[PDB]
């Protein structure tokens, strides 16, 4: 699998592939690895499927209970801290997973969390099997002066290169941009195909 | 006759403590709610009499989910504790099944929680009454809760000091399918007729849902138009 | 004389609290049931007096399995809790043995549950009475339950405020093997003769089973034909 | 004088609650049993007065094993719970040792269970009395049980409302070695002389064992020949 | 063993073989691996026999208790979520099983669940030892414009190819089609033999 | 004055419940025992008044080991439970140390068991008194037990309804070293002088041990020679 | 060891050998592996001796308690379900045993249960070390149109071939036929020797 | 009427023990607080009457975090225990979420802690009242706590012996947005008007926070300038 | 070590050697492996010394408590069942022991119990290191028409052959015959030496 998350000026973009395997044997050509975790932040998945889905369910529950008890969204540092404490309360029966949470509260963030519960800030991060490819292209082409369209084009080029050069990843890319103004929005697949045909990465 | 101390049966077959809890919730704030054409509302009288109270920050209509809300009446501390139990129970059902498919399950678990402290000794019952409102897969539902844990389903109900006066007005003047504007108008007329014995009402607090969207609690300005 | 507070023996050998629970279930809703030629029915009087009550959604005939049903009388909260215990116990027997082979086992476990809170201090008895009905491998069975946990098997029985009047009519006019239509007619005449002291009956709620198929609860329209 | 509330010693050295349980079992159904030449019987008066009761399905002679049976008297709910305890205890001894070698061990464990709630506070005594009958390796045994947990071994004994009248007839007219037919005849004459104060007996229920075979409960037709 | 589940327009079709082994040594020429779990959904079995039967018993119990407490059938996403939570509450004493649940509530679904509790949607799925064969033929011949008869013929051809080319599978095929209109119905074996003799796959 | 309800200290320094247990054991069966030249005996009056009681099968002299026996007086149910505790405690010492080297250890553990229910609330004391007899490595020992858990060692002692009359006869007429025949004769004369107020004795039950061999309980025929 | 159980028209026949070892070293020339579990059903043994005997004791206890609490015999599907639940409540401290229960309630059944608790219906089944031999001869000669005498002759021929070609089995065969009419009856050994001398399998 | 012993409901629906705790906190030290333009203050009257008391070392304004403080009134021991519970609860939220984002969560957990000992028997309620003050992400907040566990949010509130007199002065003379100097002057005038009935005030203790920085408790010299 | 137990007409004979090692290194030339467990039955020892002695202590305790609570001796099937349940309640912290209990209640019995708790009847049984030798001679010379003297001579010849051909066994043989008439009696060693010198097996 592969994930990607990029912080730019006033927005943060996350995208994944959708191919779940669950054997060697690619088994599901259309999974779901990107999850809206709250009205201003989301979460990606790059590990064991069942453990990852249970973590997504628990974090949805805890953030909704949070927002209702306090009537404000949770800070991104707080949700990363909570996730790290949850993963490090049990590490000798551990969750084999690599998580990546991004969002915006007063400033955009994207945080990486390993299986041992190490949370760390960064401006662009990625996890999964084909992750070094997208780190290569993000290191080569990334600028923090980009717009939202330039950013999502960079993301599509990245995941396209990962699908070209990795066995485990593949399938149709989906992308969701989260900003402070318009909130969480997932791009429709027709727009994604339009950007792919514009950039000339289709075969 | 027998014990007015702790919950046992009487010679007339009456749980005295659960009675005494019902007169405790009769001493509380009045609040009501009703279904309308494609949803349900909840309006509470506001217990503001000091100007030092942070008017809008004291909410008696509290959210349990984005798809179940609750307004309470009775002892305010038992109210807060029970509402938090309802919140975490809704979260449990979200964890287990994936969604809150029945709001009736949610009122039933809370009512079982109240039945236990109706059942056992060493503890008093919950002296609090609540009404639950929201849509589920079935549709708009409006419940009530009782210090015994009795639940009943309504199209419109009340709670509090103005229980009976409001319920008499609702018994006369309720229409089943009703647009939201005329619904909140009818609800305010109900709240008026009872609470206008201190010859004042105030701005009340009022929330609503329609099927297919989330929760909306009014602001201070919108309610005074219907006032 | 001795304690009317908590369940101990008296000088006359009487559990006072379990008595007081029996007069608590005498204050409840009347309901009855009877076997017919190849099954059994259950009819409940409906406690509807407000028009705001969601008439059909309040059910006192509740299902325990697809092959055991129950109608209750007494304190409604204790009723709901006990009925849920019966539901999960039937599910336990489905897990363990593969099927619900005896409905008598199911009433006996619930009756033991009531006997415990008859037996111990620190808690009052369950002030509720139920009748169970359904077919098993043996055939149609009709049980009763008592605040002590006493069970008895009937061909026809009652419960509630109209216990005695209904049981007198059944004692006179019951026929053992009876087609379903005449059976529900006889049951309604029973419910009439008692509950027609407020000079009204209403539409009651009524369910039935025949051997070899599942459960059928009537709708609002069908019961008024037999009314 | 001291407490008629809960089991403590009195100034006259008397456990008042265990007394009050004994008058509770005096208010029950009469039943008796006796040994005969190579076995033992148990006969119970049947508490049938309604025609709606499913006559044969209500059994007061209940089996604990294929080689121990029991008939009870007193509170019927405590009876059922205690009989089920005896059943699972007999099954425990079948698991552990391979067979039920002594029926006296089985009555002693049940009697210890009754002694405990005679002993502790926070619980009333078991208001129930039972007699046990069956053969073991030793031979035919006939026991009795008491709300204190007292056991005694008999050749013939009674229990219930007709305790004393029956025991007087048995005290006069019992013969030790007796063929089964004349034994059940003598037992019915005993049950008659007491219970014929309401000037009726009915068909009673009656079971028997001979050494070397299993249990036989009569049917409805056979008992009326000896009636 | 092998299973198959296919979602089409307004119905979903599931079928299994019936041969249980329980040693190398094929031992039972007529088992039972397809189970009606509720009046509008069913479940298949592709793992360890005892653990699988205990899971079937528990899910029958929980769904019947559900339907009686709430008087409505459970959504398919909800039953997959419940099954995933049950399997992932214990994974270090795990159930060696591959499950596949399908059904219809307002739209047909068929969900695959591994031993670790990873639930994922798909339109056609399969599990078992001979599963790659039926994935091959379903990938080659499957269309979503099929009718119920075309679908069940595709299913019979699939399981026929799996019996031809796999050691573990075999025995008489049984098939049950579940639709919204007629509810759960299992096809009689005479109709199944008629379809086999029609398609010409018998020897 | 203070509580005759539950075991607390009085203003005169008296545990009222343990008193009330002592008058409970005064209401029981008389029994006694004495040492002789190389052993000790135990004789019990037999509580047979019905002919239906299985005379020999009711034993009040019960064995704890092959080298400790016990006869009891008081409440018979508490007697049976306490005697079984003594049996399993002797078996514990057989497991742990290999043999029952001191019978005084065995009476002390049982007496601690009675002291606890003398000590705590929520429970009454054991209303039972026992005497223990047997040889150990030290030799013949004869103990007594008290509802408080008080133990005393005797050469001869009594218990029961004829406590005082028997103890007066023993106080006058006991000789320390005595052959077994004259010992059981002296014991029967003791039991006579007290129990011959109902102008009957009966055949009593009586056991004996000499140092160096196991237990011997008499039969029905042998005791009537000394009668 | 070896077992056998055959369902025919209105009766079911079970038989075992009697040789228990308990080392390599055959140790007991006359054991007991067939057990009447209830008045209309019985149980065989093909595993570890102690665990198997404890299972027999427990099932005797539970079925007798059942029959006394409910005054009816247990269905064969119910007793197999109970046995499967008991074996699968503990599988990581498992019972090394292969069980086979047969009986008749309204129709004859014989069920096989492995060590993991997999219950499955069949019309003829066998367990033990010499089990493939009797599966061979039952597959070759079995018909469901047999009588009771033809069935028990088939059983004796089967166990005779197993004793001829297996090391672990041996000793004197015992057989018990259970029918609805006459109840559980174990054949006397003189009749068994008569059938052996009739079929001509003695040496 | 019913029990003034332990917390149960009364005939008038009143928890008597929680009342008696409220008159216990009426017997305490007066203290108050109010918001100002960009923060909040807390001033306590000092209970110094001996010269042997180490004046400054007795603090009734105690810190819960660097961003929540508390001043208490009532029983001083219950005060100290409850304040320590609040401290460790704030530390729990720091460990779990990373920061103390809502001070309302912190007062609600402490209020639930007080509700429990309002709810259960076997224990009296906390006879103590507190006000909490500090900024969070939302901004300046000022709470109150009640022996029932009732919380209310204020712009200005009081507690103690001078509850009512101070609250009357605040009800008249409070201005919402106010610079810190005039704020502490208004607060001292409030504390004066009440506590100047013993015709003395003393130097009080007083702390403050502005948004964006930590806590500042005054020293002895600074408060006398505003005195 | 070695044990032996032989059932004949109205009596049962058990005997062991007495040599305990407790290293390779034979350490105690006179142990005790035969134990009177009750007035009409006894027990032998063929395993780990400490565990075996604890089992002997426990069974003495339980049978004496039994005889006192019920005033009758325990049946041999009952004591074997109790011993089997005790050994099979803990088998994953097992007792490394082979037990053999014999006695008479209305008919003589001798039962063998392994470490896993498998109880089985037999008419002659043996355990221990030199056990196959005494099984050989008992198979060769045993008849059930023997007298008590012929039986005890057979036993002495058996254990003599085991001492001649086994390393672990040895030391002075002791023998106890248990019958219904005279109860448990252990033969004096002078009579044993007399029988050895009569049979001519001494060197």
JSON list of N, CA and C in Angstrom, two decimals, chain D residues 159-183:
[
{"chain": "D", "resi": 159, "resn": "UNK", "atom": "N", "xyz": [-45.67, -34.94, 55.48]},
{"chain": "D", "resi": 159, "resn": "UNK", "atom": "CA", "xyz": [-45.30, -33.54, 55.39]},
{"chain": "D", "resi": 159, "resn": "UNK", "atom": "C", "xyz": [-46.53, -32.76, 54.97]},
{"chain": "D", "resi": 160, "resn": "UNK", "atom": "N", "xyz": [-46.61, -31.50, 55.38]},
{"chain": "D", "resi": 160, "resn": "UNK", "atom": "CA", "xyz": [-47.65, -30.62, 54.86]},
{"chain": "D", "resi": 160, "resn": "UNK", "atom": "C", "xyz": [-48.73, -30.27, 55.86]},
{"chain": "D", "resi": 161, "resn": "UNK", "atom": "N", "xyz": [-49.89, -29.90, 55.31]},
{"chain": "D", "resi": 161, "resn": "UNK", "atom": "CA", "xyz": [-51.03, -29.52, 56.14]},
{"chain": "D", "resi": 161, "resn": "UNK", "atom": "C", "xyz": [-51.53, -30.69, 56.96]},
{"chain": "D", "resi": 162, "resn": "UNK", "atom": "N", "xyz": [-51.66, -31.85, 56.32]},
{"chain": "D", "resi": 162, "resn": "UNK", "atom": "CA", "xyz": [-51.94, -33.05, 57.06]},
{"chain": "D", "resi": 162, "resn": "UNK", "atom": "C", "xyz": [-50.65, -33.71, 57.50]},
{"chain": "D", "resi": 163, "resn": "UNK", "atom": "N", "xyz": [-49.82, -32.99, 58.25]},
{"chain": "D", "resi": 163, "resn": "UNK", "atom": "CA", "xyz": [-48.69, -33.65, 58.87]},
{"chain": "D", "resi": 163, "resn": "UNK", "atom": "C", "xyz": [-49.22, -34.56, 59.96]},
{"chain": "D", "resi": 164, "resn": "UNK", "atom": "N", "xyz": [-49.84, -33.96, 60.98]},
{"chain": "D", "resi": 164, "resn": "UNK", "atom": "CA", "xyz": [-50.06, -34.63, 62.25]},
{"chain": "D", "resi": 164, "resn": "UNK", "atom": "C", "xyz": [-51.11, -35.74, 62.16]},
{"chain": "D", "resi": 165, "resn": "UNK", "atom": "N", "xyz": [-52.19, -35.50, 61.42]},
{"chain": "D", "resi": 165, "resn": "UNK", "atom": "CA", "xyz": [-53.25, -36.49, 61.29]},
{"chain": "D", "resi": 165, "resn": "UNK", "atom": "C", "xyz": [-52.74, -37.75, 60.58]},
{"chain": "D", "resi": 166, "resn": "UNK", "atom": "N", "xyz": [-51.98, -37.55, 59.50]},
{"chain": "D", "resi": 166, "resn": "UNK", "atom": "CA", "xyz": [-51.38, -38.65, 58.77]},
{"chain": "D", "resi": 166, "resn": "UNK", "atom": "C", "xyz": [-50.38, -39.40, 59.64]},
{"chain": "D", "resi": 167, "resn": "UNK", "atom": "N", "xyz": [-49.54, -38.66, 60.36]},
{"chain": "D", "resi": 167, "resn": "UNK", "atom": "CA", "xyz": [-48.51, -39.29, 61.19]},
{"chain": "D", "resi": 167, "resn": "UNK", "atom": "C", "xyz": [-49.13, -40.07, 62.34]},
{"chain": "D", "resi": 168, "resn": "UNK", "atom": "N", "xyz": [-50.30, -39.63, 62.82]},
{"chain": "D", "resi": 168, "resn": "UNK", "atom": "CA", "xyz": [-51.02, -40.41, 63.82]},
{"chain": "D", "resi": 168, "resn": "UNK", "atom": "C", "xyz": [-51.54, -41.72, 63.24]},
{"chain": "D", "resi": 169, "resn": "UNK", "atom": "N", "xyz": [-52.10, -41.66, 62.02]},
{"chain": "D", "resi": 169, "resn": "UNK", "atom": "CA", "xyz": [-52.56, -42.89, 61.38]},
{"chain": "D", "resi": 169, "resn": "UNK", "atom": "C", "xyz": [-51.40, -43.85, 61.08]},
{"chain": "D", "resi": 170, "resn": "UNK", "atom": "N", "xyz": [-50.27, -43.31, 60.63]},
{"chain": "D", "resi": 170, "resn": "UNK", "atom": "CA", "xyz": [-49.09, -44.13, 60.37]},
{"chain": "D", "resi": 170, "resn": "UNK", "atom": "C", "xyz": [-48.53, -44.71, 61.66]},
{"chain": "D", "resi": 171, "resn": "UNK", "atom": "N", "xyz": [-48.56, -43.93, 62.73]},
{"chain": "D", "resi": 171, "resn": "UNK", "atom": "CA", "xyz": [-48.10, -44.37, 64.04]},
{"chain": "D", "resi": 171, "resn": "UNK", "atom": "C", "xyz": [-48.92, -45.54, 64.54]},
{"chain": "D", "resi": 172, "resn": "UNK", "atom": "N", "xyz": [-50.21, -45.55, 64.22]},
{"chain": "D", "resi": 172, "resn": "UNK", "atom": "CA", "xyz": [-51.02, -46.70, 64.62]},
{"chain": "D", "resi": 172, "resn": "UNK", "atom": "C", "xyz": [-50.86, -47.89, 63.68]},
{"chain": "D", "resi": 173, "resn": "UNK", "atom": "N", "xyz": [-51.01, -47.67, 62.37]},
{"chain": "D", "resi": 173, "resn": "UNK", "atom": "CA", "xyz": [-51.38, -48.74, 61.46]},
{"chain": "D", "resi": 173, "resn": "UNK", "atom": "C", "xyz": [-50.28, -49.18, 60.51]},
{"chain": "D", "resi": 174, "resn": "UNK", "atom": "N", "xyz": [-49.03, -48.82, 60.75]},
{"chain": "D", "resi": 174, "resn": "UNK", "atom": "CA", "xyz": [-47.98, -49.20, 59.81]},
{"chain": "D", "resi": 174, "resn": "UNK", "atom": "C", "xyz": [-47.45, -50.59, 60.12]},
{"chain": "D", "resi": 175, "resn": "UNK", "atom": "N", "xyz": [-47.23, -51.37, 59.07]},
{"chain": "D", "resi": 175, "resn": "UNK", "atom": "CA", "xyz": [-46.58, -52.67, 59.16]},
{"chain": "D", "resi": 175, "resn": "UNK", "atom": "C", "xyz": [-45.31, -52.59, 58.34]},
{"chain": "D", "resi": 176, "resn": "UNK", "atom": "N", "xyz": [-44.23, -53.19, 58.84]},
{"chain": "D", "resi": 176, "resn": "UNK", "atom": "CA", "xyz": [-42.90, -52.90, 58.29]},
{"chain": "D", "resi": 176, "resn": "UNK", "atom": "C", "xyz": [-42.71, -53.53, 56.92]},
{"chain": "D", "resi": 177, "resn": "UNK", "atom": "N", "xyz": [-42.90, -54.84, 56.82]},
{"chain": "D", "resi": 177, "resn": "UNK", "atom": "CA", "xyz": [-42.72, -55.55, 55.56]},
{"chain": "D", "resi": 177, "resn": "UNK", "atom": "C", "xyz": [-44.10, -55.79, 54.97]},
{"chain": "D", "resi": 178, "resn": "UNK", "atom": "N", "xyz": [-44.29, -55.31, 53.74]},
{"chain": "D", "resi": 178, "resn": "UNK", "atom": "CA", "xyz": [-45.60, -55.13, 53.19]},
{"chain": "D", "resi": 178, "resn": "UNK", "atom": "C", "xyz": [-45.49, -55.20, 51.68]},
{"chain": "D", "resi": 179, "resn": "UNK", "atom": "N", "xyz": [-46.32, -55.99, 51.02]},
{"chain": "D", "resi": 179, "resn": "UNK", "atom": "CA", "xyz": [-46.33, -55.97, 49.55]},
{"chain": "D", "resi": 179, "resn": "UNK", "atom": "C", "xyz": [-46.87, -54.65, 49.04]},
{"chain": "D", "resi": 180, "resn": "UNK", "atom": "N", "xyz": [-46.40, -54.28, 47.85]},
{"chain": "D", "resi": 180, "resn": "UNK", "atom": "CA", "xyz": [-46.55, -52.97, 47.24]},
{"chain": "D", "resi": 180, "resn": "UNK", "atom": "C", "xyz": [-48.00, -52.52, 47.11]},
{"chain": "D", "resi": 181, "resn": "UNK", "atom": "N", "xyz": [-48.89, -53.46, 46.79]},
{"chain": "D", "resi": 181, "resn": "UNK", "atom": "CA", "xyz": [-50.30, -53.16, 46.61]},
{"chain": "D", "resi": 181, "resn": "UNK", "atom": "C", "xyz": [-50.95, -52.75, 47.93]},
{"chain": "D", "resi": 182, "resn": "UNK", "atom": "N", "xyz": [-50.72, -53.54, 48.97]},
{"chain": "D", "resi": 182, "resn": "UNK", "atom": "CA", "xyz": [-51.26, -53.21, 50.28]},
{"chain": "D", "resi": 182, "resn": "UNK", "atom": "C", "xyz": [-50.56, -51.98, 50.86]},
{"chain": "D", "resi": 183, "resn": "UNK", "atom": "N", "xyz": [-49.32, -51.73, 50.43]},
{"chain": "D", "resi": 183, "resn": "UNK", "atom": "CA", "xyz": [-48.59, -50.54, 50.86]},
{"chain": "D", "resi": 183, "resn": "UNK", "atom": "C", "xyz": [-49.24, -49.28, 50.32]}
]
